[PDB]
Amino acid sequence: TDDSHDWTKLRYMDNHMPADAERARLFVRTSAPCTITGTMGHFILARCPKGE
Amino acid sequence: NFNVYKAIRPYLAHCPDCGEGHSCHSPVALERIRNEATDGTLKIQVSLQIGIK
């Protein structure tokens, strides 16, 4: 939230003010859990298995 | 019995895929997967040594 680059944290909108959260609990899934190779800003890189 | 494991230790070995589509030497190296049992049980050989510290 304080505009500091911390690779272990992420911020999100809660009501009207941004709030921090733990990056280690960010997950992506397609039909099985995927692997998040890289993250930055709004964008995520994931190597997901086949799914719909 | 685990007395046979007193003289031996785990090791590192090559791995075709370390979870990201790249090759890195891993403490878990998949040596040989044998599925000879007819009920689907797998016996897996890995570089670790489980049950002994």
Tab-separated table of C-alpha atoms in Angstrom, chain B residues 23-48:
chain	number	residue	atom	x	y	z
B	23	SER	CA	16.423	-28.784	-15.762
B	24	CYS	CA	18.014	-28.419	-12.345
B	25	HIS	CA	19.790	-30.930	-10.141
B	26	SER	CA	17.340	-31.874	-7.434
B	27	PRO	CA	17.482	-33.607	-4.058
B	28	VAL	CA	14.461	-35.546	-5.355
B	29	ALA	CA	15.591	-37.367	-8.477
B	30	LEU	CA	13.214	-39.898	-9.994
B	31	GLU	CA	15.323	-42.994	-10.583
B	32	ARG	CA	12.958	-45.807	-11.520
B	33	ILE	CA	9.182	-46.240	-11.315
B	34	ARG	CA	8.114	-49.886	-11.307
B	35	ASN	CA	4.412	-50.716	-11.565
B	36	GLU	CA	4.626	-54.499	-11.741
B	37	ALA	CA	1.719	-54.925	-9.317
B	38	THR	CA	-1.607	-55.644	-10.987
B	39	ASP	CA	-3.677	-53.559	-8.555
B	40	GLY	CA	-2.115	-50.237	-9.541
B	41	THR	CA	0.248	-49.715	-6.614
B	42	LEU	CA	3.430	-47.898	-7.631
B	43	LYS	CA	6.864	-48.362	-6.089
B	44	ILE	CA	8.961	-45.252	-6.656
B	45	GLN	CA	12.711	-44.901	-6.141
B	46	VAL	CA	13.944	-41.421	-5.250
B	47	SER	CA	17.192	-39.831	-4.102
B	48	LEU	CA	15.947	-39.043	-0.580
